[PDB]
Design a protein around this ligand. Structure first.
Ligand code: 6JI
Ligand code: UDP
Length: 439
């Protein structure tokens, strides 16, 4: 016998990944890249020059930099730079040519860049299935989503979703004159959905069974989350030492994510609740937000509270390590999807303080569907300290809070099952990996 065998393996398959330059898009892409590199794939991650440093410190993965109302031009710039990176890799020798580009779902034009260069495109959605179908329905323009909520109250019924009140819909009016643009960006994720080679969602099937099945019947979506493990952030040693020295189940973790900015009055209400509650607290107040703290209050600051507890204000923390720490009682969150799913994967019940876009819908599901949190009552009204304290008491000091915690521990076990061998998310990711190898 005489002939040649050709082997298609992860080690000689080159995966390109390109997140939108924002931490709630960068981070789940990174986690996915680590998982794919673990399977042996060659993974090159592309990111803008102004996020290269953060991505560089947080992480084996090859890293490439490109350059950065400025969105309309952002599309034009990264279309060109990523296309060039694809062609240069098509001609090199120290790497396999790219087989697939994993791109952020909010950049659907990258599908044309991939297909126009002869490679496959995988769209990574960074928000849950449930709010994403809301975007799809807004795009279809059949049902009327306009809200002059001063005139009456509406409740919207969509297939395979619970009834949504007005305050449960994605929040766009916060952006005022920019609401149309932000709206457009989320809706346009679905413009070319029938042409995407792989539709990836950072969620797990048991979490969103009804709507995921609905989507699975229209499109061939792959639920592959949580992508985070069951990434080196700044202040890791400082935060872990402080938490290590606290009592079990005693710390309220507070963070509003990477971009939300609260008013000075809102900061004062949160501050007065945290300084008077019967719990320790770790509160992330980003450097550029520190000036909105009450004047009566710099990498970090330590406090003894009016209730005799301890507080730490810090400009950033390793959130996943924080959420998995035994000292943490609950998570006061803006309900960004990464924060929500990270808390689910850690068993931490939540106090929901949503600010805009998908955070309002996420809080609806957190409180009423998954039943692992309580949502505060004001979408732009001030949340007063008395209301915050009410939610702390319900979550951390009530029999209802014990049930919320039991619920979160149940969902934590299911998220671990989903990404373990035989789990739905492990199967879907291996479907991605295996079929990329196909002849
Ligand atoms: C997150 C996102 C909406 C959700 C979805 O994934 C798409 C995201 C796109 C980028 C995001 C956008 C809305 C918030 C922004 C940070 C906004 C901004 C910039 C500077 C500032 O000072 O204030 C606000 C303008 C735009 O850069 C934003
Ligand atoms: O002190 C912090 C605060 C946030 N995060 C991370 O930053 C992401 C926040 O994204 P999310 O979807 O929750 O909200 P966004 O910032 O996009 O509004 C998550 O991966 C968090 O783990 C963090 O590592 N440290």
């Amino acid at each position: 016998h005489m002939g040649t065998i050709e082997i298609s393996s992860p080690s000689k398959t080159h995966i390109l990944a390109f997140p939108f330059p924002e931490k709630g898009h960068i981070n789940p892409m990174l986690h996915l890249c680590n998982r794919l590199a673990s399977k042996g794939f060659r993974v090159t991650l592309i990111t803008t020059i102004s996020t290269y440093k953060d991505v560089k410190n947080k992480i084996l993965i090859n890293l490439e930099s490109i350059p950065d109302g400025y969105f309309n031009q952002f599309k034009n710039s990264v279309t060109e730079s990523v296309a060039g990176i694809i062609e240069e890799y098509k001609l090199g020798h120290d790497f396999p040519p790219p087989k697939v580009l994993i791109y952020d779902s909010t950049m659907p034009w990258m599908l044309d860049v991939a297909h126009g260069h002869g490679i496959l495109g995988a769209s990574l959605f960074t928000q849950p299935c449930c709010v994403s179908v809301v975007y799809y329905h807004m795009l279809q323009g059949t049902i009327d989503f306009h809200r002059e909520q001063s005139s009456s109250s509406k409740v919207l019924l969509l297939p395979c979703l619970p009834p949504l009140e007005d305050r449960d819909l994605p929040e766009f009016d916060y952006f005022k004159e920019d609401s149309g643009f932000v709206s457009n960006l989320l809706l346009n994720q679905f413009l070319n959905i029938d042409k995407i080679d792989y539709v990836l969602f950072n969620t797990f099937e048991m979490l969103e069974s009804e709507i995921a099945n609905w989507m699975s019947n229209k499109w061939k979506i792959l639920t592959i989350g949580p992508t985070a493990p069951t990434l080196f952030e700044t202040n890791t040693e400082v935060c872990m030492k402080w938490l290590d020295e606290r009592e079990p189940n005693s710390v309220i973790y507070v963070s509003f994510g990477s971009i939300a900015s609260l008013t000075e009055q809102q900061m004062e209400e949160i501050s007065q609740a945290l300084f008077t509650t019967n719990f320790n607290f770790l509160w992330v107040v980003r450097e550029e937000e520190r000036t909105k703290l009450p004047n009566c209050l710099p990498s970090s600051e330590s406090f003894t509270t009016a209730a005799g507890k301890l507080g730490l204000i810090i400009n950033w923390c390793p959130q996943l390590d924080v959420l998995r720490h035994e000292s943490v009682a609950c998570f006061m969150t803006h309900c960004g999807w990464n924060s929500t799913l990270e808390a689910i994967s850690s068993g931490v019940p939540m106090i929901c303080v949503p600010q805009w876009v998908d955070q309002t819908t996420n809080a609806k599901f957190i409180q009423d569907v998954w039943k692992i949190g309580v949502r505060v009552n004001n979408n732009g009204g001030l949340v007063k300290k008395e209301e915050i304290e009410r939610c702390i008491k319900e979550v951390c000091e009530s029999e209802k809070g014990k049930e919320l915690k039991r619920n979160a521990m149940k969902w934590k076990d299911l998220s671990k099952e989903a990404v373990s061998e035989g789990g739905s998310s492990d199967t879907n990711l291996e479907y991605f990996a295996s079929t990329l190898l196909f002849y």
